[PDB]
RNA sequence: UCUGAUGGAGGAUCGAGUUGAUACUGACGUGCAAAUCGUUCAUUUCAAUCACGUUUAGGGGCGAAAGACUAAUCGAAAAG
RNA sequence: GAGAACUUUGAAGACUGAAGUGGAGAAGGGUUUCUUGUCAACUGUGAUUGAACAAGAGUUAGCCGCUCCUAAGGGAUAGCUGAAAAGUGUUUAAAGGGGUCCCCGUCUCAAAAGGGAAACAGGUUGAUAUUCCUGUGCCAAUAGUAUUAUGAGUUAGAUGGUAACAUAUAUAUAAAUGAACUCCUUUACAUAGGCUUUACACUCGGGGUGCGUUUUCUUUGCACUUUACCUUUAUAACAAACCUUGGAAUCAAUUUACUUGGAGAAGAGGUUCGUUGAACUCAAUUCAAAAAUUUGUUUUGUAGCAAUAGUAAUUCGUAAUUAUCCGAAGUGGUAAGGACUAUCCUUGAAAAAAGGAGGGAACGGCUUUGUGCUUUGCUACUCUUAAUACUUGUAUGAGCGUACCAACAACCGCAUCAGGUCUCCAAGGUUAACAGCCUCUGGUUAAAUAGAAAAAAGUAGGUAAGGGAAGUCGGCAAAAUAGAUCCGUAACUUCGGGAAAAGGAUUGGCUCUGAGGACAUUAAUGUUAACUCAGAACUGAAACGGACAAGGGGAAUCCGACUGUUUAAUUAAAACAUAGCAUUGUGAAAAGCCACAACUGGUAUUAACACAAUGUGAUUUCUGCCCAGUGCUUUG
RNA sequence: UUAUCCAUUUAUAGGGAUGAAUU
C-alpha cells in the first residue's frame, strides 16, 4: 500500500497496461467520502476524495479496459 | 564533612585485613586514581585505562607506563640517554 | 479499593503503625531531591531568560 | 523430541507398522509385540 | 491482562532475540523480535563515528541506496577533521622537504 | 603409590595455555637487507593490553620494501612510548627511547630491553614487565659483548644482536599486596591451573611423599639430589643452603 | 581543621529465589523414596549458579585433599 | 447404562492464587494425537471412563528452524616412528582460488541458545497453522542475443551548499566511468551504578452501548469501546556529534551525579546519525498576502495498510441489515534504546559475508588504406531498469523436520512412585516487595478406596493455675520482640567498627491544619497533579507492626584471622584453601619441571616483577643455640 | 666446512662511506 496524493500520477497509472483490478469504497464519515484503490503487481495504490463530485467525475473517467470492484 | 580520620580511600575494605597492610596499600591508590599531567597538551587528564595504559581524556593519545606511575626512578634513565 | 483511595488521598490512613517500609523505602530521598534540585534550577533558567537576574548573580546560586 | 531426523522418522513408522497386531483370518489356518509405556525402543 | 510466549523457535532471551511486544485488531497480545541493534561506522584516524552514513546491518546495509552510504569528499571514511589534517600536513611536509633540499645546498 | 600432581602437570589435559584471547605471539622485526645497512622507521598505530602478560603489548605498522602495502606486528612495549612515536630499526638507527639497535654500537652503561641470545630469534630475553638488562662493555676487537641480566649474571653476546633503548614498562607490578581470594583467582584465570597450590603434607600418604603421619611433618629431609627420578623431586631441589639470605 | 549535603565503593549486612543440608539425632524406616517428608537452618555481586557443547580412561584421570569421585559398585572401576 | 461415592450435564460450596496442575518450547519419549466401537486382562476399590483393547484418520513453508561460517576441539592429508594395530599433524610438501605470466592457499566436520538475506493480520477443521484460505508484502537470483519503453551522460565518465553535507520521487530514488594492487569499517562483544526516552501493562474521569443488585441508598457496580507487518514510511520532538559566525576572569554553560572551554566557551543560525513510526497542519484542499512560485486562515483522513477484519449489542429467511468503536491524564511494573560515571595484576572471541576508500589499466559509432595499429569520408550515441521475443536441455523458489507430553499418570527412577529434570510470558488488593495471605483471566474439584463411632496408643498441633531450668550430659524442642519512627548506645579497637549493641518511648478509626509542582496574562489575577511527611483535636472495655510476615540478648575463655570448599547415603569442623611470609632450582633450545615405547610434546602466543617445587598461614612483637647423626651441595 | 645439530622468515639485495611511496 502507497498512498498517493497528486491526481496526474494516478491518471498516468491508469493507463498503465500492467494494472488489473479497481476498487471503489464509499462509507459515512460524520456524506460519504470514497478511496479509489488501483491493484497492480508491484503494489495497492489508493486515493482518498473528500469531493463526492470529485469521485463521481474521476470513477468514470478510469478505463473501461479493467475490472471494477465494490467490497458493500 | 570528613567522615573518616585516617583510613580515607581504603574504607571500602571494611575492617578486614591489616592496617599494616591498609596503610601500605593506601600509598599507591591514592596516587593511582588521581588524574596526571599530559604532556601533549597540559591538561591534567590522564588517568589509567589498563596496568600499564594511561590515556588523556583530551587528547586520546594514549601513552605506556609503569603499572600505576606514570613515571619512575626505573624510567628516569631517559637523562643519562637523551644528555647524549 | 477506590472508596480506600480516595480515603488515602483525603488522608486517612498514614498511620505509623500503618507504615511498614523505611523512611527511604516509601520515598526515594534521592527522588526527592532531583525534583527539587529540577524545580529550582528552571526556575533559574526562566530567571535567565526573563533577564531578571545577572549572570554573576545567578552562577552563585 | 519434536526435532528429528529422516531415518529416526522412517525408523520409527516401521516400529509403529510392526506394532500391528497378527490378521483374523491368518489364524484361520502374536508375542513379539511391544507396548507404548511398558518397552522403551530406545532408538 | 493478557500473557504471550515466543514464536520463533528460540526461546531464550539472548541478546540477538530481544522482544517489542504489540497489541493485535484480533484483540490479542502478540509478540515480535526487534532486529539486533548495529554499530556504528568510524574513522581509521580518531576511531570516531563518522555522519553521513547509515549505520544498518550486513544485509541491510547492502541493500541501502547508494545515497546512504558516503560522503562526497575525498576519503569520505575519514572524518572531515581528520581529513583537513591530513590535508595540510600533507602540503606543508612536502613544502619542509623542499626548504630543507634548497638549504642543502 | 599412583601419579602424583606434580606429575600429572606436564601430560597437558588441563594445563594448557588458555590462548583464546591472547592478541598474538610477542616477536620482533625480523632480518632483512634494510636492517643489515641503514635504518628503516615504523610508526605505532595502537597499544593495547595482552590478558596474559603484564606488559603491554605495541601495534606497529611497517611497510616493506617489495610488496606495495603494509604489514603489522606485535612488539613488547617498553615505557614512555607513545603512539605517534616513530620507531627506528636497524643499525644506523639514532638510539633513543623504543627504538632497534645492535649490541655493538649503544655505549656501556644504558639500559635496554628485548635481548636477543642468538641473532635472528627475533627477541627471547628481558620481556617481563618492568625490568631491564645493562650492558658492561664491548668487546675490544667487536663482535662481543657482556650484559647483566637483572637475575644478576654476566652473559656474552655476539654484536649482531638486537635490542630495544629504555625499558619495558607496567613498573613495579609487585608492589601493590592482593588483599583478597578474588583477585588471585582473576590472575591466574588467563594463565594456567596453578592454584591453588595445597599443601603437600596434608595429602594423603600416598599421592604425595611428604604426606602421612598423625602430625603432619615430613619426616625424612625435605632436600633432594638432583640425580633423583621424576616422582622423588618434590622438597628444595638440591639446595645449597637453607634459610634468610645474608647478601 | 569542624559542620550540612550530594555521591554510590565494598570477594559489606538481612533476606525470599536458586544452591545446600545445621538441628530436631523429629516422622517413615515391610517407607512416597535402595536417602524421602515437616519445621528449623545456610547462601544471594561474586573464589557465584545453571544449561548445551568440549577435553582428561584404570596402575590411569580428577581432586580449594575426606582415601573423595570416576554410572547405586573404588585402598585400584566395569565386560569377557 | 441392568448396574454410578470415584462417567457425563446443571445447581452449590471451594481450591490452584499468575515463582499456578495456565499458555508455549528444549533434551527424552514415538502415536500416547482425533473420531467411531470397545471391557478378556489393567486402570492395586467400583467402573459405562481411560495414557487399556479394536478399526480408521491426522503433521502441507522461497519467509519458523536445520542446511551456511567460525570456538574451545575432533578426524584426516605430507613427512616421522611403530611389525602392526596405532601415535603424531608441516617437524626437507613439486600441496587448490583469482587475475592475466603474477599473486594468494592443508582439507573437512563440529552451535536447532553465537553471527546469521526473507512475514504479517484475520478466518480455517475431529485431529495441522506465521505452513491451509483470504488479503497485503518482502527476500534472493534471473543466460546470450534482438527489440521496444523508463532515465541519466556525451559529442571518455553529473550536480548544488562557504560547512557539517545534500541532490535521480521514473509504477520501481536503478544508472554519478572505473582494472591490477592495498587500508580500513561493519559483522563484533565485561560488570556495577544511577538518570532519561519510548512502547507494552496497570489505573483514573467523561461519552456510548449491554449486563446485574436494588427490604433500604446508590448521576449506580461489571464487560466492550481495538488496529499488525510493510510504505529509504513522511515529519515533529529529544539525548549527542559536527559546521558557520561569534572571541570570554567579575570565569563561564551544565548533570541527580562531573563534565567542557583560546587545540575556541557562551549567544544566534544550521547539518547529521540514533531513538521512536502519523508526534507536528502531516497530506492535498476552501480562503488572503509574495511573481514569469513563497507565507497565514479552514475542510477532510483512524497518514495508506483500515473496516471489507474482529468485539460488543439490535432486528430479520433461519444468510443479510441496523447503530458504537473517542475529548483527555496518572502509576512505575516490566523490556529496549540513549548519554554517562565507576571497577579490574579479570580488559571482556572469529570467520562466513557485506560496505567504503587510496589508486588510475581500457575507452564513440559507421566505412576504408595499409602490418589491433596511422590513415582517409559522416555523425544523432554510452550505461541501467521493466517488458517482449528467439536460441540454449524444460531459464524461479531443492531436501528434512511441523501430531502429541513436557511430568499433574505420556522422561528416568523395576511402576499411573509425594523424588530429580533446562528457558519466556507474570493481574488486583494488602505491603518495601515478583514474600505471606485473599481474589479476577485460565485450570481443577483429582491424587492405589469410601460410610459410621470416636476409646487405648501413635502422630501434626493448641492451651494451661502457682513456682520458673529445680529436668537433663547439655535450657535439645518450644516461649519470649521481631515491623516502622523517635530517643539513647558502653568495654575494646587494626579508629574502619562493634552497633539494629545494651535500653527505652510511639503505633487504630473518623474529622481537620500546614508544607512539598507544572501551566498564561499586563508586580498582580487565573488554569491544574501526586501521594509523602509534620502537627491537631474527638473516640473506644487503654487497644491498634491486632492475622499474615519477623534478631532473644549479655559477661566470658579456647580454636580458626574473614567471605569460600569438602567426606553424594552416619562426621561441616578446630580440616583444606586463600591473601602474606620465606626458601630452592633455572640465562633456553647442549637449560629447569614434566609426558612419551621412539618420533615427539606441555609449561610456552613463555623469559627472573617469569616458570617449577615447597613449608607457614591476616596484622603486632618475635622467629634463641647446635653441622656431631642423616641428608643436600661446593673445589680437586 | 661438507658431516651433523640449532634458529629464522615469502628462505627477498656481496662487503664498507599518527599521511603515500605499486603498473
Redesign the pocket.
Known amino acids: 500500500?502507497?498512498?498517493i496524493?497528486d491526481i496526474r500520477?494516478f491518471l498516468?497509472?491508469s493507463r498503465?497496461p500492467?494494472t488489473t483490478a479497481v476498487?471503489i469504497?464509499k462509507?459515512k464519515?460524520?456524506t460519504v467520502?470514497t478511496?479509489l484503490?488501483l491493484?497492480?503487481?508491484?503494489?495497492?495504490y489508493?486515493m482518498?476524495f473528500?469531493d463526492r463530485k470529485k469521485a463521481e467525475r474521476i470513477e468514470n473517467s478510469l478505463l473501461p479496459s479493467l475490472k471494477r470492484i465494490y467490497?458493500? | 564533612?570528613?567522615?573518616?580520620?585516617?583510613?580515607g580511600l581504603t574504607?571500602?575494605?571494611?575492617?578486614?585485613?591489616?592496617?599494616?597492610?591498609?596503610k601500605q596499600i593506601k600509598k599507591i591508590?591514592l596516587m593511582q586514581?588521581a588524574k596526571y599531567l599530559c604532556t601533549?597538551?597540559?591538561?591534567t587528564?590522564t588517568?589509567?585505562?589498563?596496568?600499564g595504559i594511561w590515556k588523556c581524556?583530551?587528547?586520546?593519545?594514549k601513552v605506556c607506563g609503569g603499572?600505576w606511575s606514570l613515571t619512575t626512578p626505573?624510567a628516569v634513565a631517559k637523562s643519562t640517554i637523551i644528555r647524549l | 479499593?477506590?472508596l480506600?483511595?480516595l480515603?488515602?488521598?483525603?488522608?486517612?490512613?498514614?498511620?505509623?503503625?500503618?507504615?511498614?517500609?523505611?523512611?527511604?523505602?516509601?520515598?526515594?530521598?534521592?527522588?526527592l531531591?532531583?525534583?527539587?534540585?529540577?524545580?529550582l534550577?528552571?526556575?533559574l533558567?526562566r530567571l535567565?531568560d526573563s533577564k531578571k537576574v545577572d549572570?554573576?548573580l545567578?552562577?552563585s546560586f | 523430541?519434536?526435532?528429528?531426523?529422516?531415518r529416526?522418522?522412517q525408523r520409527?513408522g516401521k516400529?509403529?507398522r510392526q506394532?500391528?497386531?497378527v490378521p483374523h483370518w491368518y489364524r484361520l489356518k502374536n508375542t513379539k509385540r511391544r507396548?507404548?509405556?511398558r518397552t522403551?525402543?530406545?532408538? | 491482562?493478557?500473557?504471550?510466549?515466543?514464536?520463533?523457535?528460540?526461546?531464550?532471551?539472548?541478546?540477538?532475540?530481544?522482544?517489542?511486544?504489540?497489541?493485535?485488531?484480533?484483540?490479542?497480545?502478540?509478540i515480535?523480535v526487534?532486529?539486533?541493534?548495529?554499530?556504528?561506522?568510524?574513522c581509521?584516524?580518531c576511531?570516531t563515528?563518522?555522519?553521513?552514513?547509515?549505520?544498518?546491518?550486513?544485509?541491510?546495509?547492502?541493500?541501502?541506496?547508494?545515497?546512504?552510504?558516503?560522503?562526497?569528499?575525498?576519503?569520505?571514511?575519514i572524518?572531515?577533521?581528520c581529513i583537513r589534517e591530513?590535508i595540510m600536513?600533507?602540503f606543508?611536509?612536502?613544502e619542509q622537504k623542499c626548504v630543507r633540499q634548497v638549504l642543502k645546498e | 603409590?599412583?601419579?602424583?600432581?606434580?606429575?600429572?602437570?606436564?601430560?597437558?589435559?588441563?594445563?594448557?595455555?588458555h590462548?583464546?584471547?591472547?592478541?598474538?605471539?610477542?616477536?620482533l622485526r625480523?632480518?632483512?637487507?634494510?636492517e643489515?645497512?641503514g635504518y628503516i622507521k615504523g610508526?605505532v598505530?595502537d597499544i593495547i593490553?595482552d590478558?596474559?602478560?603484564?606488559?603491554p603489548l605495541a601495534k606497529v605498522?611497517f611497510?616493506?620494501?617489495?610488496?606495495?602495502?603494509?604489514?603489522?606486528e606485535l612488539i613488547?612495549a617498553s615505557e614512555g612510548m607513545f603512539?605517534?612515536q616513530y620507531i627506528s630499526c636497524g643499525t644506523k638507527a639514532p638510539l633513543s627511547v623504543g627504538n632497534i639497535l645492535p649490541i655493538g654500537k649503544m655505549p656501556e652503561g644504558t639500559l635496554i630491553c628485548n635481548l636477543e641470545?642468538?641473532t635472528?630469534?627475533?627477541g627471547?630475553?628481558?620481556?617481563?614487565?618492568?625490568?631491564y638488562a645493562t650492558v658492561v662493555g664491548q668487546s675490544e676487537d667487536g663482535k662481543k659483548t657482556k650484559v647483566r641480566?637483572?637475575?644478576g649474571?654476566k652473559?656474552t653476546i655476539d654484536a649482531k644482536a638486537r635490542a630495544m633503548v629504555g625499558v619495558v614498562g607496567?613498573?613495579?607490578?609487585?608492589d601493590?599486596?592482593?588483599?583478597?581470594?578474588?583477585?588471585?583467582?582473576?590472575?591466574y584465570?588467563?594463565?594456567?591451573?596453578?592454584?591453588?597450590?595445597?599443601?603437600?603434607?596434608?595429602?594423603?600418604?600416598?599421592?604425595?611423599p611428604?604426606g602421612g603421619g598423625n602430625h603432619?611433618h615430613?619426616g625424612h629431609?625435605?632436600?633432594?639430589?638432583?640425580?633423583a627420578?621424576?616422582?622423588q623431586?618434590?622438597?628444595?631441589?638440591?639446595?645449597?643452603?637453607?634459610?634468610?639470605?645474608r647478601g
Open positions: 500500500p502507497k498512498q496524493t500520477k498516468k497509472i498503465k500492467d476498487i469504497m462509507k464519515s460524520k467520502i478511496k484503490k491493484r497492480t503487481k508491484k503494489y495497492l489508493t482518498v473528500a467490497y458493500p | 564533612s570528613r567522615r573518616t580520620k585516617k583510613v574504607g571500602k575494605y571494611g575492617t578486614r585485613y591489616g592496617s599494616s597492610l591498609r591508590e586514581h601533549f597538551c597540559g591538561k587528564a588517568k589509567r585505562t589498563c596496568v581524556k583530551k587528547c586520546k593519545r603499572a626505573a | 479499593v477506590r480506600y483511595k480515603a488515602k488521598r483525603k488522608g486517612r490512613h498514614m498511620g505509623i503503625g500503618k507504615r511498614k517500609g523505611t523512611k527511604n523505602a516509601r520515598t526515594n530521598q534521592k527522588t531531591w532531583i525534583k527539587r534540585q529540577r524545580v534550577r528552571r526556575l533558567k535567565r549572570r554573576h545567578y552562577h | 523430541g519434536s526435532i528429528k531426523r529422516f529416526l522418522k520409527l516400529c509403529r506394532n500391528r497386531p507396548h507404548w509405556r522403551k525402543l530406545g532408538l | 491482562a493478557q500473557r504471550v510466549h515466543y514464536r520463533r523457535h528460540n526461546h531464550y532471551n539472548t541478546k540477538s532475540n530481544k522482544v517489542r511486544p504489540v497489541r493485535t485488531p484480533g484483540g490479542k497480545l502478540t515480535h526487534v532486529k539486533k541493534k548495529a554499530g556504528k561506522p568510524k581509521a584516524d576511531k563515528a563518522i555522519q553521513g552514513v547509515k549505520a544498518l546491518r550486513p544485509a541491510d546495509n547492502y541493500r541501502a541506496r547508494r545515497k546512504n552510504r558516503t560522503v562526497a569528499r575525498a576519503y569520505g571514511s572524518c572531515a577533521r591530513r600536513r600533507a606543508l611536509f612536502e | 603409590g599412583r601419579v602424583i600432581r606434580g606429575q600429572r602437570k606436564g601430560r597437558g589435559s588441563i594445563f594448557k595455555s590462548n583464546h584471547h591472547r592478541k598474538g605471539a610477542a616477536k625480523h632480518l632483512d637487507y634494510c643489515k645497512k610508526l598505530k593490553h590478558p596474559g602478560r603484564g606488559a605498522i611497510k616493506r620494501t617489495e610488496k606495495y602495502g603494509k604489514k603489522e613488547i603512539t605517534g641470545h642468538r635472528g630469534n627475533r627471547t630475553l628481558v620481556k617481563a614487565s618492568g625490568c641480566l637483572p637475575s649474571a652473559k607496567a613498573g613495579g607490578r609487585i601493590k599486596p592482593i588483599l583478597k581470594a578474588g583477585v588471585a583467582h582473576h590472575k584465570r588467563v594463565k594456567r591451573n596453578c592454584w591453588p597450590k595445597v599443601r603437600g603434607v596434608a595429602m594423603n600418604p600416598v599421592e604425595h611428604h603432619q615430613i629431609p625435605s632436600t633432594v639430589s638432583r640425580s627420578p621424576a616422582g623431586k618434590v622438597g628444595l631441589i638440591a639446595a645449597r643452603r637453607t634459610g634468610l639470605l
